[model samples]
Target: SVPAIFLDRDGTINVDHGYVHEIDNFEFIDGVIDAMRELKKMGFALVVVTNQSGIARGKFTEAQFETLTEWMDWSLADRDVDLDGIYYCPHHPQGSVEEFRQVCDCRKPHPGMLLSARDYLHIDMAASYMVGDKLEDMQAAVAANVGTKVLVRTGKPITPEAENAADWVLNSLADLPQAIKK
Candidate 1:
């Protein structure tokens, strides 16, 4: 089975400002590109799982998300770091937009995205890991039964509970490659 590293999009990949849609607003976390490159070279299938409730909240559109994703893919590819999958949930139970309003399973804390990625990518869930800056990401990984959970402090403050829950805690994505290898 293939090993995968599931990463949260906002906060994990790029900086998580509220409703980041535009390329201008999208900023890569420090050393993210380098980290992804190293991870790819080490033969881990990279996948991004995000909860984009902004779409459901009417703050952004699917088209905008797709466009930004394309750009991000291209940017990563330029550095020889390619993501195997990108999955995002556009639903929120209390969302303002009716179409996107629902308690969907794909959202973080549900394990839907990670499970789907496992099935599609033939990933070994027990040998995989999830990295993010939020508790929901840790919860999702735990539910998915991933081997490791990493919490980084970049886009959000790390709570004491979240820090305790994480398998490893780091300063930023910059330090992930070294920690994961260890």
Candidate 2:
């Protein structure tokens, strides 16, 4: 099975322009491309794990999420980064909109999405790494029992509690590529 790399979408890949479901709102972060390429060189199959609460909050539709994801996939391909897959959660318990309000196992803080990704990619979770910037992300990664958990401090300023969930922390996505395997 292929080794995997689980990356968060908002801050790890693009500037979190406030619950962005629009392709135009996604601006690539400073070091994301290079970091991804470095992981590529290390023979890691890239996958994205993100939580889109905006869908539950009525900020956007699930269709918009898919559309934007397609744009992102195309954009990454243009940079020569072949991502294996991407996954997201559209459920929220405290959703402002009724359609989105539900407790979902696929949401972060739960292991459902990661498990599904692992199954889809036929990956070895114990040989994979997860990078995210939120509590729920870290929680899910841990619950899924991934090999490593990296907390990239891009969006959502962290708290002291963050140290408990992650194995490593970084100010940005700038230096994560080489760090994945080491």
Candidate 3:
């Protein structure tokens, strides 16, 4: 089985401009493409696991999200960074969209998405990594039994509790290579 890096889409990758779906608004965080390339070079399959409740909340449609995702893929491909898989949860218990208005396990803080990636990608969870900016991200990693949980300070205000929960806290994704080396 291959080891993978499970990345969060918004704050961890692109700048989270609050339910971003427009190509005009989407912007990659500094060093993200380069960092992803480095991780890819290290023999880790790159997968994105994101919680996109905006679809459920009626802020954006899944098609819009897909369009943006395709754009992201194209942009990354231009830089020689290829993603192995992308998974997102569109459910929210309090969602306005009837189809997505239910509690689901694929959201962050749950291992459903990671588990699915593991099964589909043949990922060795015990040798893989989870990197994100939220406590839920770390919680999901813990539940999924990922080898390392990295909290990047590129987004969200992290609390001490969140810091303690992570195996490593980094200034940003750019620091990931050095952290993983240790």
Candidate 4:
């Protein structure tokens, strides 16, 4: 099984503009591409696990989200970054959309997405890393039994609880390579 780097979208890879689904609104975080390249060189399968509850809340459609995702993938591919997978949870407990309203296991603080990646990619969970900007991200990593949990300060308020849950807490994704090397 191959080791993977499970990434959290929104605040971790791109700036979080609250339910961002438009390509025009999406912006990559500084140094994220370079950091991803460095991680890719280290032979880890790059995967994205995100919670896109906007779909459930009727802020956007799944098709719109997919369009943005395609753009993101293409943009990254242009930079020679090929992601292994992108898993998202469109469900929310109190969503306005009945179809998407549910307590799903794939959302953050749950290991569904990571576990699915593990099974689908034949990933080595003990050697994989989970990186995100929220406490739920770290909590999900913990539930998945990921080897390392990293909390990046690019999105959301970093609470003491969040910091404590991560094995490494960095200013942003840019600091990940150096932190990992050490």
Which pairs of residues collide in model 1?
Answer: none
Per-residue lDDT of model 2, residues 26-98, tens digit only: 8998978877877788898999988899999998999999999988899888888989988888999999878
For all predicted structures, in order, the TM-scores are 0.97, 0.93, 0.97, 0.98
Tell me how candidate 2 scores on lDDT: 0.85
- Model 3 lDDT tens row, 1-182: 99999999898899988999999999899998999999999999999999999999999999999999999999998999999999999999999999999999998898899999999989999899999999899999999999999998888788887798899889888788767887
Expressed as tens digits, the lDDT of each residue in 114-180 for candidate 1 is: 9999999999988888899988899999999999999988866799888877898888777877986
| Reference-based lDDT, each prediction | 0.90, 0.85, 0.92, 0.93
**Which candidate gets the maximum lDDT versus the true structure?**
4
The digit string of per-residue lDDT tens for model 4 on 28-104 reads 99999988888899898999999999999999999999999999999998898899999999999999999999999
* Alpha-carbon deviation at 7 in model 4, angstroms: 0.2
Off-target runs (Cα >4 Å) in candidate 2 are 96-98
Error of 4 at 135 (Å): 0.8
Q: What is the lDDT of residue 39 in candidate 1?
A: 89
> Which candidate order results from sorting by TM-score in descending order?
4, 3, 1, 2
